[PDB]
Amino acid sequence: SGPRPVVLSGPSGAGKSTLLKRLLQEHSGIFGFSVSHTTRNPRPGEENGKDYYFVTREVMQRDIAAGDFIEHAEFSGNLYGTSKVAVQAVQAMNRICVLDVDLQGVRNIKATDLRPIYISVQPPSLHVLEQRLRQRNTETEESLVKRLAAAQADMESSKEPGLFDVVIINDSLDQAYAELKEALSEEIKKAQR
Ligand SMILES: Nc1ncnc2c1ncn2[C@@H]1O[C@H](COP(=O)(O)OP(=O)(O)O)[C@@H](O)[C@H]1O
Ligand SMILES: Nc1nc2c(ncn2[C@@H]2O[C@H](COP(=O)(O)O)[C@@H](O)[C@H]2O)c(=O)[nH]1
Ligand code: ALF
Ligand SMILES: [K+]
Ligand SMILES: [Mg+2]
């Protein structure tokens, strides 16, 4: 009836992070980022407590047994999870929770009662995704290949009926960001009432 959380997914290197950062900055009073937990090493320019909760695998696994995570899955040999407190933190600020998860996270979230909107940020082609991943250069050659492999599997699943409410083709960043705003108009209107 009113505002609902937002689940944004897609293949690695498809522009999900950049689209969210512009959305969060331009709409700080509407959207709050869900800070997931990860076991991978921090990228340059990454800050703990904002992009992720950078923890070791022992710390992450101790939290899984403690039940701190609404969802969790492994990706590229590193652990990821959405903590229950991460969603509650955004809810405590009267903001729409925006989550960045993989395909496994989306299916896990389909079980939960958050009832979010599902947005898939897709590249124009698989080859373009490789170039954008290679330009970022934050992954090893082996990690890039398996990230490419998971991209195509998530690419085909993006066409699953009823999985993604809205699919964004990330060809032009301005065009993709405009489409993101348009699909979020109902959420922004609901939050502002
Ligand atoms: N519209 C676009 N055109 C060209 N490159 C883009 C576009 N959007 C994003 N990128 C590339 O994607 C990279 C960042 O991707 P990122 O959002 O971190 O991937 P993920 O979706 O896994 O978070 C940047 O290096 C940027 O060059
Ligand atoms: N299941 C799940 N996946 C996540 C979570 N956070 C990030 N991911 C996904 O894991 C991958 C990690 O990408 P990175 O953040 O290392 O660039 C991305 O596909 C991202 O969407 C999470 O909390 N849970
Ligand atoms: F969210 Al990414 F590579 F930046 F999976
Ligand atoms: K996240
Ligand atoms: Mg990201």
Domain CATH for 96: 3.40.50.300
Q: How far apart are CA 184 and CA 159, in angstroms?
A: 20
Ligand 3 atom closest to the CA of 139, numbered from 1: 3
Q: How far apart are CA 85 and CA 96, in angstroms?
A: 14
- CA nearest neighbour of 70 among 111, 38, 98: 111
* Structural tokens at position 60: 């992450």
Q: Which of 4, 115, 147, 193 is catalytic?
A: 147
* Structural tokens at position 3: 């505002």
Q: How far apart are CA 121 and CA 10, in angstroms?
A: 5
Residue 154 domain-assigned (yes or no)? yes
Domain of 162, in residue numbers: 6-192
Angle between helices 103-111 and 141-157 (to 10 degrees): 50
Method: X-ray
Residue 1 domain-assigned (yes or no)? no
136 labelled catalytic: yes
C-beta of residue 116 within 8 angstroms of C-beta of residue 60? no
* Structural tokens at position 13: 């290197």
Residue 68: Cβ-neighbour burial (10 angstroms; 0-12, 13-18, 19+): middle
Q: What's the domain count of the chain?
A: 1
